[PDB]
Design a protein around this ligand. Structure first.
Ligand SMILES: *[C@@H]1O[C@H](CO)[C@@H](O[C@@H]2O[C@H](CO)[C@@H](O)[C@H](O)[C@H]2NC(C)=O)[C@H](O)[C@H]1NC(C)=O
Ligand SMILES: *[C@@H]1O[C@H](CO)[C@@H](O[C@@H]2O[C@H](CO)[C@@H](O)[C@H](O)[C@H]2NC(C)=O)[C@H](O)[C@H]1NC(C)=O
Lengths: 48, 48
């Protein structure tokens, strides 16, 4: 039963690639998001 | 008369400082400003 699980393989190929690109997009948005000042918008800050 | 010109020194000290900081601000805004796509705002392009 530790080797039986199919995981996400039961999904169709199109839906599987859609889920993969959604996960990648969410991770990238979190990793490279920027905010900056209302008065000096030339320099922005990351999160970390 | 090539050495006699008073230049910008006739201005008051506060006004001279104001003009200098205005010029520096304008140059920096031109140099470091950037724009980016409406759909993927994570990466933004400079001018040059
Ligand atoms: C994991 O994947 C297997 C095969 O990929 C799946 O088995 C299917 O099971 C149904 C119902 O018994 C059969 O009618 C199909 O013919 C099987 N294969 C197909 C074509 O999907 C099953 O979904 C999963 N097995 C477990 C234990 O979770
Ligand atoms: C710039 O040089 C001029 C030329 O002398 C200086 O002008 C003086 O003030 C008035 C306006 O020209 C004149 O009537 C005086 O004869 C000038 N005497 C001086 C030396 O003040 C002016 O002072 C100089 N500007 C600065 C910032 O020193």
């Amino acid at each position: 039963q530790a080797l039986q699980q199919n995981g996400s393989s039961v999904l169709s190929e199109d839906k599987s690639k859609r889920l993969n690109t959604i996960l990648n997009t969410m991770s990238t948005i979190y990793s490279t998001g920027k905010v900056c000042n209302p008065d000096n918008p030339q320099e922005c800050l990351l999160l970390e």
